[model samples]
Target: MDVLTKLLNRRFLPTIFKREIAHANRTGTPLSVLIIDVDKFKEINDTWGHNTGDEILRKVSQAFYDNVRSSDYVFRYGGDEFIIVLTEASENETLRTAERIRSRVEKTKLKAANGEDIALSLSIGAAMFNGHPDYERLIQIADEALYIAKRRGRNRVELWKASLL
Candidate 1:
């Protein structure tokens, strides 16, 4: 378990994502990547403390891991970022999963040591494989979508579109 997230470390993400992409290409199956970030995570860390921030991370990680399929891969990509690899899923399925994850995160509540309730929300961007299997490109697309979601508002899900590029 990672110290903050109790999830797989970020170092393991690239190889897994790449291998999954290759597998999807060879099998002609669809895969999706979802890049997620906690909204205003730095504010949470600043307003509270590192300990509270770590607790929030743990809870968020658990929510994602618990809600996803057993085959899905969830990685702690950064301090407040996560990546979900959805295998054998179509665009619509990935969109549904992204919505579900966003909804779950929005509904989660974290309690501060000072007896205040902290609201948690995620901005998610998702991209599905479309015959091409470039892991880095997929990540870039998802990251862009995440940026759009954040730009639009917190706690929203955005699917990657060719027009967005």
Candidate 2:
């Protein structure tokens, strides 16, 4: 569905997560969730206007969607935030995928409506399903890690560890 953001609608995110989690649980395989945030997004909007910020969001979503495997699902969780669901992936695999997206976004550049160069970066947090597999809890964990990533430094990937909580 082509929405404003050109990504999966947030309304369907929970359903997709439920199905994936169910499948992972049934097969005793690992599932991972990565929460990504656009760093300095508010500043970008304030400086370049919302149109430029929207363009950056569209491009960033496309970048993540293109880089991931067909089996994975990408969703526009909210403004300046995206979620990726990786099926049958381990913690290492998830972290590597997050890092790959972070690097790709960093190298890419966008332009504002006024033709000014816009640099983009993302802070990503990843969490692997370790227990009973609750998607809501998984999202919270990933979000927490995302905050930590931003706190440590923007444009970095952080994996959720038990110690973090």
Candidate 3:
């Protein structure tokens, strides 16, 4: 376990991803991944220090947890970024879930320890797993989509399409 979190092991990802992919394929259910990055995240730590940054991060992450079902897996992906594995989730459902998480975080009072408002926005990228063994590409696609979200604006969700490549 890493000091920042009880869970941040680099080795843990492959094990879970392999199993998740196998399960989804066996059940004929779609698998989707969502990568969420906090917008303007560095400014928080730079301006208010880590104490406030960590506090806001926890609240932002809580918003994400609130929107996902227990069936989904939410991993912090090592700090201010999160990866969610949605088993048996459709494209529409995945987008809706991402939007809902964004909305919840936007409405919540994410504040610094000093009560200063922290304007938090999540740039989310999502992709559906095609029937391929190249799971790394699946993650790359989602990450590409995430950059597109960041490019378009700070708070939005983007789904990867072949045309976008």
TM-score of each: 0.91, 0.89, 0.89
Per-residue lDDT tens digits of candidate 1, residues 1-165?
653445667788878887887788788888898999988899999899888998878777777876678789888788889898899888898898888778887888778889898988999999987766567888899999999999998799998889744
Off by over 4 Å in 3: 1-10
Error of 1 at 66 (Å): 1.6
Residue pairs whose backbone atoms clash in candidate 2: none
Give candidate 1 misplaced runs (Cα > 4 Å).
Answer: 1-6
Residue pairs with clashing backbones, model 3? none
Cα lDDT tens digits, model 3, 31-123, are 999999988888778888888777667777677667777787777775668888888889999999999998887777766767778787889
Model 1 residue 93 lDDT score: 87
The C-alpha RMSD in Å for every predicted model, in order, reads: 2.2, 2.2, 2.8
Mind sharing the TM-score for model 2?
Answer: 0.89
Instruction: Summarize candidate 2's per-residue lDDT along 42-151 as a digit string, tens digits.
Output: 99998989878877877787678767888888887877888988888888888888888898899987888888888899999999887655779999999999999999
